[PDB]
């Protein structure tokens, strides 16, 4: 009905059987080869893990359990008075493989609202943190400290049956998702709103709304952006560092709290979670260098400079995707309707016309189109979320959705300890010579 | 000379060139195949990554840059008045590939002693933590909060050259290793010594000694055990979850602090870091069930019960190793000389005679010999380290050695973002049908 845990109880045995069958038939089917470059090249191209919740076609971008962003935009339930998809509904999709109903979504909003309370020790911890401790550091430490609340960790050590793992994981994952906005907003307020309180969860507001309230914003459209934001950042295959980290750490039977916090430390990495910031920085430098308002051909010549000087035009390209990110388009649409005359956006809008035209000519590229990160920055800034250091906190709150959805399934399906084999260069050399 | 950073400056270009050469020749050499079972089976058997510091021959156990535990026991410098190898020397080995000199070791002791101070905010954090927050949770959160001290994170965001990455990483790794005992001991004292202070670093004592002092022990032989302990837990290939996690998170250019803390959350997992505890628990239950003193044939029959009832005799077997763990033998030797009449040990000693004899007959096994975890427990208990929840803190303090040694080399060699490809079951099915 509306009880997700019950629907999950239904789905799991079917998937387990489907998997076991496939492994009996095709377990020894070679699905690719491992080269020396793949070992040195951070496993690039190597099919390495099964992750069920989302799949990225390098052609049309990301699909959540079969559905594209555009479909999600239309099918997923919206806020009462909204036109953006509730991330609750997206969680539901990743977990069940089914588009939810308004009732299902509403039920999930209430569930998360019921579970959202922080333990005192985590409030103390956040409240005592200095202002120079990075937001993501605060987040990761806080979530680690939450592991005191873990069902799974307690029950595991009592000797619960493997079959029951997923159930504990679900409860913890549900608890964690509920608390994350609280954590995230306590960080925001401690850092930028002089330690004021987050205030109260409204039991009748959606997750994204209770969030933006706790962050101390009130503008309708910032809450709609957030809804979009949290939806579209939620998942991106299992190969990305935050996903994979979560998966790897979970594989050792570390609870969702420890699994998520590990993931956040990977999300904190410049090469994964910071591109938003780097775009916004680069743009600000662009406007400083050749001016805030510009003709297309002027804009064009600046581009080449960045390149030939040994610098990446940021927000463009991707490790695997090979076309304009649905997650960009998504945001563009949001900005063709809600701030078409915002100047930073106009510039974002302009680079979409010029950057692609060049870049390919530079050769070194593969992916000549914008990624999600090219666009998120100006939207956040526009509503007064100007604190760039904080922006990955948003991303993480979102990415909890996908990686916890998967973590449940990973435990449900009994995936084992991730434990690839390493080789030293020397050993790898003595291997190939043989 | 004694300045490790200088020797590292020397070694790196040589290794870079050796690697580049090998990649030019053999980059496309297939070194194995990926099956469907490897994707579902947590990458088991799949050569996936290059990790230089240690290699595990499934036959003779672990080698540190070419040397076995027995060699390390003889070659590595010892404390002045010691017979156990200083883990400083082991760090030196993993970093340089060279057995160090007493002078090199002494220099490293002094370096770590100089860098050991904790920032106030981390002391506040530890000092405010409740007693029910797991030691490993405390550790991981503390190390995350240390990232405020990161050289690498600050310099990265200023736009330092890739070539300089390793240098920053080395400084951070050196700082972190130095602070870890302080963190670890502050946790120990807060939890078990009523919040007493850790006291002072002696600038003329080795790392292991300054540790056991801060932990509030004084017995010579506990400090010698610790020296052995920290040495032999230090590294175990890059495939183990803590190593790999560190490697994965580092690959995103997260600083050593974030990389290590992520690793600790994986080490916290029952399937990686808890076997020590599970052994000690199982043993205590064994003595409760059939008595504290026992004949060999009695002991023998109990074993079968554990098995046939659907339970693992813990401390025996390993994901990859296939013989008596050097890390066990190591400890046995330490207990054939320092507590041969300790009863818990006698029992450990007795199971080494009976368990192997059976187990294989159970079939399900592959690895019928003891791992390191079968032995560490009774040694720690013997000197009054009876707090089992804390034992993984020790393991982590040790494992920092190997995974930071590697993290330096990973940055030195310019290893890229780890980013394997995932597939859903459904996608994997539509792949094989094609
Ligand atoms: C995302 C990104 C890292 C993917 O690159 P990759 O998969 O590692 O590598 P590529 O296949 O693009 O490498 C081909 C070349 O194109 C370059 N390149 C890729 N995108 C580029 C861009 N937008 N501007 C300039 N050069 C670019 C790479 O630096 C590389 O140059 P090289 O051959 O001299 O090393 C890259 O597009 C980039 O740096 N973009 C900016 C950062 C960003 O937007 N990140 C967010 C996604 S996580
Ligand atoms: C370490 C360990 C997990 C490795 O097992 P693995 O590589 O996952 O799997 P194996 O190749 O041993 O699996 C073969 C069978 O032997 C069993 N097995 C392995 N060691 C065993 C032991 N000491 N006692 C009983 N059964 C054992 C496994 O449970 C498995 O049974 P199954 O076929 O019914 O599933 C396993 O030896 C174990 O559980 N030991 C105790 C825990 C421990 O000491 N861990 C520390 C190392 S991280
Ligand atoms: O997919 C990637 O590697 C890029 C990304 O950060 C994500 O969306 O998670
Ligand atoms: O090698 C493994 O997987 C077991 C272990 O925990 C280690 O020593 O790190």
Swiss-Prot record, chains A, B:
Residue numbers of N6,N6,N6-trimethyllysine PTMs: 366
Taxonomic path: Eukaryota, Metazoa, Chordata, Craniata, Vertebrata
Function statement: Key enzyme of the Krebs tricarboxylic acid cycle which catalyzes the synthesis of citrate from acetyl coenzyme A and oxaloacetate.
Swiss-Prot/TrEMBL catalytic activity: oxaloacetate + acetyl-CoA + H2O = citrate + CoA + H(+)
Modified residues (N6-succinyllysine): 28, 47, 74, 164, 292, 298, 346, 364, 421, 430
Encoding gene per record: CS
Cross-referenced InterPro entries: Citrate_synth-like_lrg_a-sub, Citrate_synth-like_sm_a-sub, Citrate_synthase, Citrate_synthase_AS, Citrate_synthase_euk, Citrate_synthase_sf
Family the entry assigns: Belongs to the citrate synthase family.
Active site as annotated: 272, 318, 373
List of residues that carry N6-acetyllysine: 47, 292, 298, 346, 353, 364, 430
Post-translational modification: Methylated. Trimethylation at Lys-366 by CSKMT decreases citrate synthase activity.
Gene Ontology CC annotations of this record: extracellular exosome; mitochondrial matrix; mitochondrion; nucleus
Residues the entry annotates as binding oxaloacetate: 327, 399, 419
Oligomeric form and interacting partners: Homodimer.
Miscellaneous notes: Citrate synthase is found in nearly all cells capable of oxidative metabolism.
Protein name: Citrate synthase, mitochondrial
One record GO biological process: carbohydrate metabolic process
Pathway the protein contributes to: Carbohydrate metabolism; tricarboxylic acid cycle; isocitrate from oxaloacetate: step 1/2
Gene3D superfamilies, alphabetized: Citrate Synthase, domain 1, Cytochrome P450-Terp, domain 2
Record-linked Pfam families: Citrate_synt
Keyword entries, A-Z: Acetylation, Methylation, Mitochondrion, Transferase, Transit peptide, Tricarboxylic acid cycle, Ubl conjugation
EC number(s) stated in the UniProt entry for this protein: 2.3.3.1
Molecular function terms from GO: citrate (Si)-synthase activity; identical protein binding; RNA binding
Top-level class of the enzyme under EC nomenclature: transferase
Compartment(s): Mitochondrion matrix
